[PDB]
Ligand binder design. Sequence first.
Ligand SMILES: COC(=O)Cc1cc(O)cc(O)c1
Ligand SMILES: COC(=O)Cc1cc(O)cc(O)c1
Lengths: 208, 208
Amino acid sequence: EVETFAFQAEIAQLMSLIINTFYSNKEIFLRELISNSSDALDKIRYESLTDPSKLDSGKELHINLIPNKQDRTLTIVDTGIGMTKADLINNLGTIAKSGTKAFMEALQAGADISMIGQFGVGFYSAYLVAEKVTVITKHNDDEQYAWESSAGGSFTVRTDTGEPMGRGTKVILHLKEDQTEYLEERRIKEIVKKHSQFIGYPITLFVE
Amino acid sequence: EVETFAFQAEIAQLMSLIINTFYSNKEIFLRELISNSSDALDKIRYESLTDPSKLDSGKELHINLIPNKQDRTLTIVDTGIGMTKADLINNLGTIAKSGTKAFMEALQAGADISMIGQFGVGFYSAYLVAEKVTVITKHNDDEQYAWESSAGGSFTVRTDTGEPMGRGTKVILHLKEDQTEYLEERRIKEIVKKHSQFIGYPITLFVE
Ligand SMILES: COC(=O)Cc1cc(O)cc(O)c1
Ligand SMILES: COC(=O)Cc1cc(O)cc(O)c1
């Protein structure tokens, strides 16, 4: 059973802007996704301070980057707090309608697409490099769900029967044919060193 | 009835570092506090997306800056989500023990005190300019509380019987004798324009 939802018009507009604007500095999507993983990891750490049972679903707090040249995918996995079905549907827990508004204005008023994360919608920067994005997530309060979208105004949500993940979020980027540089080890290491060097959780880049 | 608590040793160490390190670029405390107000405002906005009653305690989402030269105070008030008593005690809702660890290392490894906010402990940057900080807060789930500390290893928490605030947080900075520039209108406007120009909520600077 797959449920199909329409994006709110402001989110569709944000996505169309990300996809259509000429903008060379696409590598910033990786910093925005690691930053989102780091924020989700902070959340579960904080809840665990007063309730250690919150980590029964996994004690390890970390971020893995997994390139796969065969499937043309780059996957980011974190063991953060995860997202409930309701959060997934409501723009992956963001206040994306009001963030889009602030970001749109900043763009006319001198900002550029790399500052997206200052408006709380950095997740959508995945569409600088991906034709399709799949998000698998498990929150302590809910079942494991898979969200997916190739943009074009809609997204789907289903229960995920794939590998159980315990707790956290996996973002699977199905890369555009011309954006395979982001599966190269040297290129990923360069971006992580450039933009993500003070993230507080181990980032492991997997080998192929 | 005033309850007095000891800071965790890592937080006392972070505060001692903030207070004792020679570091001229003190103006960054204002950006860190506005950023914290903006994050608290995002939280209440998100909860209100699925439960509008969450805003019965006040619909307006904003940040006021209130200088008072007579009391030598700069107060930042937001109508964000506020903090429960438990959050106030547990380092004002931060994961400050693990943030301090990451920040300490970044400092030996080339970072400087202005990057504090990248470690989730920007609140403590108030001690670049304040001898004493009072935080009054009201969360929908709790009573209004006042937290206070002049550093030196302890902080107090009491029920606040002062002006009811509805919902949100007020940070009252009792400025060091030599840091009164931060009560001057021209100086505040300059810092807000420099560091806080893409905050998504109206910031009103009050006149004396
Ligand atoms: C801000 O949260 C989001 O946009 C969802 C999100 C969660 C996560 O753990 C990783 C991500 O890349 C995105
Ligand atoms: C991250 O949250 C805190 O450190 C508490 C905090 C909340 C707030 O609304 C304003 C602040 O300046 C600080």
